[PDB]
Amino acid sequence: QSVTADPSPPDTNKLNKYSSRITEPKSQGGSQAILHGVGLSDDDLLKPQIGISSVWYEGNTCNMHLLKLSEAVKEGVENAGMVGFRFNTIGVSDAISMGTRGMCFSLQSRDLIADSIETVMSAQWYDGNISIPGCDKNMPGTIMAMGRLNRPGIMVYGGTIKPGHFQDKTYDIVSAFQSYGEFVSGSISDEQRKTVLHHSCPGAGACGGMYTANTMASAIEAMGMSLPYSSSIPAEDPLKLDECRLAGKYLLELLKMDLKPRDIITPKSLRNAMVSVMALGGSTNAVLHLIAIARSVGLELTLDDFQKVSDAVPFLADLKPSGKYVMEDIHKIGGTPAVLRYLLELGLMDGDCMTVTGQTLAQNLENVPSLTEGQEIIRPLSNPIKETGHIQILRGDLAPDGSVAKITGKEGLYFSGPALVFEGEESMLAAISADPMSFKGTVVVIRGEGPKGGPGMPEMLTPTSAIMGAGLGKECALLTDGRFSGGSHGFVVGHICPEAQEGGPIGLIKNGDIITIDIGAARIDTQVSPEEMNDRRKKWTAPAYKVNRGVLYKYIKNVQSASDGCVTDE
Amino acid sequence: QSVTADPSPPDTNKLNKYSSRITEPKSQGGSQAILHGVGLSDDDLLKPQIGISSVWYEGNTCNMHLLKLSEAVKEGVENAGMVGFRFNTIGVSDAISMGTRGMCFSLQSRDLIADSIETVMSAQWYDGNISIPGCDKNMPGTIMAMGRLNRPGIMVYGGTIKPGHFQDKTYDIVSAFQSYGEFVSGSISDEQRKTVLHHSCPGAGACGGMYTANTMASAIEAMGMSLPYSSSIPAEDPLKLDECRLAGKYLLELLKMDLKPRDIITPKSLRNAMVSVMALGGSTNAVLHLIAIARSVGLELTLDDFQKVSDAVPFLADLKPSGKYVMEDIHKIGGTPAVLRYLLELGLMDGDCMTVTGQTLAQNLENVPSLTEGQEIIRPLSNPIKETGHIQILRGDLAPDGSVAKITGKEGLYFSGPALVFEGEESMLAAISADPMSFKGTVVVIRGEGPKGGPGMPEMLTPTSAIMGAGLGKECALLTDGRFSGGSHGFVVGHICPEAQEGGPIGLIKNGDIITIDIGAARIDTQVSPEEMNDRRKKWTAPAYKVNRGVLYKYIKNVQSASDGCVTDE
Ligand SMILES: CC(C)=C1CC[C@]23CO[C@H](C2)[C@@](O)(C(=O)O)CC[C@@H]13
Ligand SMILES: CC(C)=C1CC[C@]23CO[C@H](C2)[C@@](O)(C(=O)O)CC[C@@H]13
Ligand SMILES: CC(C)=C1CC[C@]23CO[C@H](C2)[C@@](O)(C(=O)O)CC[C@@H]13
Ligand SMILES: CC(C)=C1CC[C@]23CO[C@H](C2)[C@@](O)(C(=O)O)CC[C@@H]13
Ligand code: FES
Ligand code: FES
Ligand SMILES: [Mg+2]
Ligand SMILES: [Mg+2]
């Protein structure tokens, strides 16, 4: 819990606790000369300095607008009497890289982003931070950096993309991904396929459903580290620019209070974040990212913590991918604060947690308009979509250190079938192409896709959509030490630990082993005896790492297990 | 030498070898929908995609102009028939962080930059790269990423800052750093001190002397990975913008030739780079960065390689800090190509190395105007400033795995003195404050500043300027496992390996040990017997790491020794 990462300030009530290190001593005249050179007056040197870290880049719709938002954040910082210094990190697009080896680089970019913002804040002695992520992994990456530094900070979510519309039909990135399967199946022509591709993503913003971006944005708001409505204002909405211009005012107040990320991110605000995930049907990736965020502030968060919140919180929101609505429809019925107000009224949330407004969650939500009368997106507690949360933690013989599944309650309580084992996604997809019926009734195992084996713990969508299009949805189960993206109508488990590369039982499974998934017992078991499994283990040798240089070899050297949130700095 | 880091392309003569992975298969319609959303037409999808990676940020003069350069690079990429996708990494300012704990974050940002550009190029499937660094570590960071990817790439140096001028007096960042010592000594008043600070850095650009930025920029041009004149055109010069607009034309040609970084960065172009360092009196940091660059392409480069080139190449350039002129004065006498033309004419360089112009170094230099008649910056081979290079590799008892020193030839051949040992820069500076005369005649050892002990292998300037201001310049020697920045008029050695944190002999030195530096034997020796040293070693226990989380704990876990270039991905 005693984190030692970044420099500590060189007194109370001082607003420039860190930048005074370089703006005040005569022995740092070199630093002051650079600062004059970038435009600071003598008066400016007395002011707090805010690092404004955006994740702009031009090759992704989620991120191409973030420089325009960064300009607005800087203008608000200046209007609040402080100095704004913009800088920008990298990010990668899951939508672009999905289905390719580029996806091996996606999860780790969260931790690269954390390292990047930490590096700049520490070296330049900035007093506070405003981050503008726009896309899946960007968000937890910025919060992790704020937790390590423990300097006042606010996350401004870039906002969600608007749905595409063409000829009385609604299209999104899900439409684009689905289009190829509908072409091969014969449902649509090549001409209809191309139309979907040209009208799926009309502008800037993150993916609209309850995928990782909106899950994490909502969760981070719920955790108190974004301003109210940050998660539900669309990316191109003029209110997003207004939020950007106001972050500086709110940050000034945080500096006056010295309200820091470790004052805001606590066991109870972490639970608030998890409640929001459960209630909205949020992504299983939130397990990885919330664990990493909790670790970044010196706290603990286990898989069991997620299971307890899941048991305690019903799934209430009729939102894609599980349901029919998108983040804009939440926005039109009162936004994320309206949802959280309802959950707080139900006693599911703790209102006493401090937030980046300088007030408590309860104080923020006191004044917010409630959910729109007659709305059908957020179900009553009396009529939930599921009595408990979607997220389910499975252990048992084959996942002794844990695993994560999204369970709707429609797949049944059990699946038993002979294992069909693949060393990588490629061999699985080839086998289901040549011989789809060989999959009927099996427990499909795609191993070697974990943090070290993948490497990079890639997300895989093609296995579930291939299973769906072969008519095998409820007829087989899918297990991996990596991650699955789309929903089957059957059992789909990821994050199996230990991963195959580490010699976990998943790497000892053989074709024909009878595997039994039991949701009530929360176990993925094998009919193979523990003694024969141990025999296989004694004979097992770890495969060679797939890379020997570069960022992914460093990831292999540094990354902890999926049950440990794949943190890299421990 | 067999590097496995990044994805390989999914045919010859194809110009979009990598982006075809996502622009051509119907199974990647999701990728194509994102690309349409960011503005690509169907015709645009057929074009090569260039990742344009700048290191812009607002808090440093070296980097604040790089977004404007990035816009020009993109416009040139489009004018050459390709698609330009801008993205931006982080960087840190050595001028701002020097003298503070922020400096522990500076060297590692080179390797963070390499990881960042590698990550984006791999995930987004870009065909080529144009990088726009502006500051010390940025430059080798971008080349390392290009070496790992081995996709056609060009480095555009951001260019050097113009000298500040006020009331018939020339000021630079060196003036600003010197100002405090001149205030404490009484040479100048507080009023004169403040004047230097306001007129030292008038605009955008890297430091003007032969510090790391200009050393590396020149070295990277000499290595063939920048266009001719990139290193010597000033940052605000309109020709820099013209260079930016032309990089796309040159990159198109590289894609047609499939001339890749591992075709350009070879043993012989690495030697060309080292020749340029020796001849210009370049920074000892170039030892670290050129080793890392050579490793990134699967090549070897040792400390002995530097000593052999140093022995073979005289110091010829009258350039700060060793001399009086700056990079702009090279620029006014024909620039870096004119210098390299002279060295090539002397037979010091290999002209057959391919470069990013698509032609050889000799072909580039055939047409360039020679050095301005009557110039006094570049000495003749008959009258060099030093018969061999400044860079000197020392081993011996106390640096068995090597060490690096800048030797002018003025300090003599020997120094012998009792050791005065400090565990960190702070205790050294306090001791020389309270008791300066206790330093007279000693060999000052500042240990625990290496890659893992510092951590971060920080650069330290205050020890040499404190020694200078106490009148002790030629009266003591300075040794460290970290790095020293400014020049003493005596012996100053850095990069001592193994570092103290790793239990190298430097961590076993005690106050009073007689240390003898012998330049001719190239040895740093101790009078203590090898048997007593081994006794000390058997009793020695490694100190606890100073951090336990964050980017610097990861650095500690990953970094190799200074003699190994402090690479992190092996
Ligand atoms: C960030 C780095 C490089 C550090 C090395 C060891 C210390 C230095 O002082 C200690 C620990 C610290 O608590 C402070 O007083 O500032 C924080 C900073 C770190
Ligand atoms: C399931 C399909 C159709 C997706 C559309 C684009 C994304 C949505 O969010 C992104 C990419 C994803 O990384 C997540 O957050 O889960 C994976 C899933 C796919
Ligand atoms: C970059 C990553 C994650 C890789 C994992 C193992 C391989 C895959 O194929 C091999 C090696 C490769 O030579 C290719 O044919 O493309 C390069 C890419 C890497
Ligand atoms: C020696 C003094 C006065 C310097 C002025 C600013 C810089 C120059 O270059 C930068 C910072 C440095 O990182 C290098 O490249 O060596 C260290 C040295 C100091
Ligand atoms: S790919 Fe960026 S939020 Fe979906
Ligand atoms: S600090 Fe950037 S080049 Fe000197
Ligand atoms: Mg994702
Ligand atoms: Mg430097």
Numbering used by the authors:
A (entry chain A), B (entry chain A): 3 to 12, 15 to 574
From the paper:
AA was observed at the active site and the substrate channel with an occupancy of 0.90. AA fills essentially the entire substrate pocket via polar and hydrophobic interactions. The carboxyl and hydroxyl groups of AA are coordinated with Mg2+. Extensive hydrophobic interactions between the nonpolar regions of AA and residues that line the substrate entry channel, including M102, I177, V178, F181, Y215, and L465, are observed in the complex structure. Such nonpolar interactions are not possible with either DHI or DHMV and rationalize the strong binding of AA to AthDHAD (Ki ~ 300 nM) as a competitive inhibitor. Binding of AA expanded the active chamber by pushing outward the residues forming the cavity, including residues I177, V178, F181, G490, and E463. The binding of AA moves Mg2+ about 0.7 Å deeper into the pocket and changes the side chain of coordinating residues.
Dihydroxy acid dehydratase (DHAD) is the third enzyme in the plant branched-chain amino acid biosynthetic pathway and the target for commercial herbicide development. We have previously reported the discovery of fungal natural product aspterric acid (AA) as a submicromolar inhibitor of DHAD through self-resistance gene directed genome mining. Here, we reveal the mechanism of AA inhibition on DHAD and the self-resistance mechanism of AstD, which is encoded by the self-resistance gene astD. Our structural and kinetic analysis of the mutant AthDHADs has validated the hypothesis that larger hydrophobic amino acids surrounding the active-site entrance enhance resistance to AA.
